Amino acid sequence: PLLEMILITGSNGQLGTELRYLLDERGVDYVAVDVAEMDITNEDKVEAVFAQVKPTLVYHCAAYTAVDAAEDEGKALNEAINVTGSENIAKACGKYGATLVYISTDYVFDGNKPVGQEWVETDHPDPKTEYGRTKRLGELAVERYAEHFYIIRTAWVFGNYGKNFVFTMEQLAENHSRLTVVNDQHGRPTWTRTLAEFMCYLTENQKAFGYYHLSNDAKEDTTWYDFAKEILKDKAVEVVPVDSSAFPAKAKRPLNSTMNLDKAKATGFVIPTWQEALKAFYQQGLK
């Protein structure tokens, strides 16, 4: 009751690493676990860590995020991590009375919203990808078992501390002169630093429990193509805009998953545009 005790799961991924370093800057202590310390798919290992740590606040950064793979070769792994693992951590948090910050996805929505319109927290999820379906089940487990929760739906996540679309683009551009990127899937990038700061803003300021949408912002419509054009603008590659029909993709990704950020902005947190965040990401990567 008098001591805050933070646990970070998925601590060595792009978001978990970002979050560790942010807490380190703020002089905040924590216990950090990932797959080599606490397999979230094994309820007994999860219980043993919570019994030792006795957390009051858990930032759950563990997820499976390979969308195409989740439809086929990774379908079993996607389900274990996003369904079972989410349930296990939600139940552990409820047992121990811990607040759970659960990171979810814009891919819970069906994506059938005109360009220009945006998804709000109270819209009904109806995911059409296996990844999104599993993440929605995770949300439902959190709501059932963790009385004190923040579910933060984020999008298109990138940062300096793990794999993502930015590094994929840069690697491909080293050896290939032409890349084809969809220009009919609308959404917004999210820098891990902005997301980690928002996670901490909710908890530091004890905002109302519930659901919050968080991506970086944009004044104008944004597609994957727009993001890739910007990332690669200093490279000798041509980024070619294509439609989603151009090549046979395994997952039917949402055509418009742009989130309304008004609730997040109502917290007082200030959200950079994705252009600003990308620039900051490049500067932070110099260290």
Numbering used by the authors: -3 to 283
From the paper:
To unravel why GacA functions as a monomer, we employed X‐ray crystallography. Crystals diffracted routinely below 1.2 Å and were subjected to synchrotron data collection. Consistent with our SEC and activity studies, GacA crystallized as a monomer. GacA contains the typical α‐helical/β‐sheet arrangement known as Rossmann fold present in SDR domains. In agreement with the well‐characterized SeRmlD (Blankenfeldt et al., 2002), the GacA β‐sheet is formed of six β‐strands, in the order 213457. This β‐sheet is flanked by three and four α‐helices on either side, respectively. The second 310‐helix η2 observed in SeRmlD (Blankenfeldt et al., 2002) is missing in GacA due to a shorter loop connecting α‐helix α7 and β‐strand β7. In comparison with SeRmlD, α8 from GacA lacks two α‐helical turns, due to a deletion of eight amino acids in GacA. No symmetry‐related GacA molecule forms protein–protein interactions via α1 and α10 as observed in SeRmlD (Blankenfeldt et al., 2002).
We show that gacA is an essential gene of GAS that encodes a metal‐independent dTDP‐4‐dehydrorhamnose reductase representative of a new class of monomeric RmlD enzymes. Bioinformatics analysis suggests that gacA encodes a dTDP‐4‐dehydrorhamnose reductase, an enzyme that catalyzes the final step in the production of dTDP‐L‐rhamnose. In general, RmlD enzymes are members of the large short‐chain dehydro‐genases/reductases (SDR) superfamily, which act on a wide family of substrates and commonly form homo‐dimeric or multimeric complexes (Kavanagh et al., 2008). GAS expresses a characteristic SCWP known as Lancefield Group A Antigen or Group A Carbohydrate (GAC).
